[PDB]
């Protein structure tokens, strides 16, 4: 992904800010609540049944740590997301079956999640460079499929 | 198809916008501009730099028609033919686009309403935005 | 959002499958799960073997459905109610799924009924699955 | 991608009965009429305000050929899919930004239309072989994108 390097900075200094034990767990259960048939895959997360139920989900929050996690390393190897992703692409494809259109769902719920927590600091300048990101993510992802 | 609760939560949520149409209108447009630079194509003629004044003018066009379209929510069709002519007969507007501009607004609303974007309302909101998109990419006259 | 002109091709060439609608809507089903094997994941405990007596009951069962459809072209929303519990409530069925079928509903209207399926026709056939497909996939209780 | 030896022989043997001069336009054709936004990429063709103007349009029929001995030329190579259609995906992607899911609903046409021509013969496992063909071709002219 191309990012110049004001973009790359103002980029690092918002994720420096991001609280890694709830943002994920919140893109993730925004994720099963907007676009509910993406729950079924989460099965064995327990109760699903109703929004309050999703995020609050101990399971989804742990699940979604990784999620954000995953999106951690990505920012730490822009150069090279498809070496990077690559195990987890073979599991999303090859394994799970997940439809590519729900990649860029979810990282458009990351943007939007962002959003919601820096308000006013989320600048369109600041999403422009996060959705080169997000779409640099679900490319890699999506790598298996190509 | 949007329950009854996801009409609810788009007027309270929409209704918090008020004197906000043409400043969050903006910011929508300029969000889906820098972020989506192919959406630039269809307002070859605009003046896109940003604070630029004819996007100020048509944030304030667009949030109005989303206004309109929550109120009356139950018979968008009608109420949104003109703009269905204008987008799907006249502009041709790839449906792509549609999602482009409907994110950004999402987006637009949770970084200025944050205790009203909660993930129901972002879920009813979704689905409002994916309908009002339907219908302005169809041709149904 | 459907055009007069829509309903009328959907309902003259819906017409013309009459009595073949079990055998269409069965042949569509195989063609999908064959196709895309994945949507096979959706019945886990059905007999998708070919020309398994299942598959035809079930192909039945998704032909008198459309057949239900294009009689209340105009109130789907109210006519579809138990199907979309089903379909978006309990079995959360992605959209995706729904374009699959669509397609494998218009390659089979088109393998049997040439004479009709003009672009015309086809056009109108694809607006009435994807508007089908928006009411079983949404939650709108 | 991945056609087993079996839908191969399916395709290829298929494909030696179809019509070049006519089915590449009944598809270009019917995907501007099903998909009427497609129209906007085709400014120049003249007349598409209807059906029939879209379905007569010399224009649509001649291209239409064109984008047919590209699917030809893909099925002669199926093992080599992105490398056939290398240039045309710098066409499509980066000179005229055409989204690829129109590259799908194009693919997805033409079955539509292989349907329409061979009514029984376009048999459900030969249709299966088909759409590994188009979604492989779709995913070669997207290329640019990933
Ligand atoms: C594009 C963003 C995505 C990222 C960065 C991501 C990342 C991850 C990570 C890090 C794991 C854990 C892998 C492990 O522990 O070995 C995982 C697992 C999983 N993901 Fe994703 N994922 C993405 C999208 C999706 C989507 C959209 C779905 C489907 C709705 C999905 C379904 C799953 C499932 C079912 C698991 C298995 C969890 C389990 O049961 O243990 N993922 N994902
Ligand atoms: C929720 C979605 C949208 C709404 C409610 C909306 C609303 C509007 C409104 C109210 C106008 C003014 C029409 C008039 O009274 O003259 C307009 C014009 C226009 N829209 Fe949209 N729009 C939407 C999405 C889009 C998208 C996604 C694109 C394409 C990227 C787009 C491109 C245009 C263009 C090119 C114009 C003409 C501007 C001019 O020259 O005056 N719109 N839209
Ligand atoms: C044209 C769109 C569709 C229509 C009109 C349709 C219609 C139906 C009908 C009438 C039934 C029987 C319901 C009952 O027993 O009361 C049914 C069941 C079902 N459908 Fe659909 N359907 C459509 C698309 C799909 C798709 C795309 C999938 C998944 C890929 C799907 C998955 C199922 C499943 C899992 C069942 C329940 C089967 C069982 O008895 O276990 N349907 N559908
Ligand atoms: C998925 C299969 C497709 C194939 C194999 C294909 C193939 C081709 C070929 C062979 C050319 C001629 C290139 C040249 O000699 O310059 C072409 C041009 C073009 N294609 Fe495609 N195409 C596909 C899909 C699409 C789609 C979906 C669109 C847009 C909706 C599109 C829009 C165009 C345009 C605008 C041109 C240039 C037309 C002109 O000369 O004005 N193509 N394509
Ligand atoms: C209800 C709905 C939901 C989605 O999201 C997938 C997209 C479109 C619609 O409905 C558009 C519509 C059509 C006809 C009358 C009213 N609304
Ligand atoms: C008319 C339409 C078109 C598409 O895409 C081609 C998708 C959905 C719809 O409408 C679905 C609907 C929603 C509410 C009432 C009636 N129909």
């Given at each position: ?146 | ?90 502009l041709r507007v790839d449906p792509v686009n549609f999602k482009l501009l409907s994110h950004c607004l999402l987006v637009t609303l949770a970084a200025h309403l944050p205790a009203e974007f909660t993930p129901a309302v972002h879920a009813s909101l979704d689905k409002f935005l ?12």
């Amino acid at each position: 992904v191309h990012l110049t390097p004001e973009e790359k900075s103002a980029v690092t200094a918002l994720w420096g800010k991001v609280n890694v034990d709830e943002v994920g767990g919140e893109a993730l259960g925004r994720l099963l609540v907007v676009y509910p048939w993406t729950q079924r895959f989460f099965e064995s997360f327990g109760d699903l049944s109703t929004p309050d139920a999703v995020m609050g989900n101990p399971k989804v929050k742990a699940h979604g740590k990784k999620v954000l996690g995953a999106f951690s390393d990505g920012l730490a190897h822009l150069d090279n997301l498809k070496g990077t992703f690559a195990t987890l692409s073979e599991l999303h494809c090859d394994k799970l079956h997940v439809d590519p259109e729900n990649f860029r769902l979810l990282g458009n719920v990351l943007v939007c999640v962002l959003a919601h927590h820096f308000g006013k600091e989320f600048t369109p300048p600041v999403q422009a460079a996060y959705q080169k990101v997000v779409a640099g993510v679900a490319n890699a992802l999506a790598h298996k499929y190509h | 198809v949007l329950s009854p609760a996801d009409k609810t939560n788009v007027k309270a949520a929409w209704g918090k916008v008020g004197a906000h149409a043409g400043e969050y209108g903006a910011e929508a447009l300029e969000r889906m501009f820098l972020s989506f630079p192919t959406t630039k194509t269809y307002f070859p003629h605009f003046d896109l730099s940003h604070g630029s004044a004819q996007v100020k003018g048509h944030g304030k066009k667009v949030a109005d028609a989303l206004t309109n379209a929550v109120a009356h929510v139950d018979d968008m069709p009608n109420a949104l033919s003109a703009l269905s002519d204008l987008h799907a007969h006249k502009l041709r507007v790839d449906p792509v686009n549609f999602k482009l501009l409907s994110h950004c607004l999402l987006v637009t609303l949770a970084a200025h309403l944050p205790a009203e974007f909660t993930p129901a309302v972002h879920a009813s909101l979704d689905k409002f935005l994916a309908s009002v998109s339907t219908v302005l990419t169809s041709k149904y006259r």
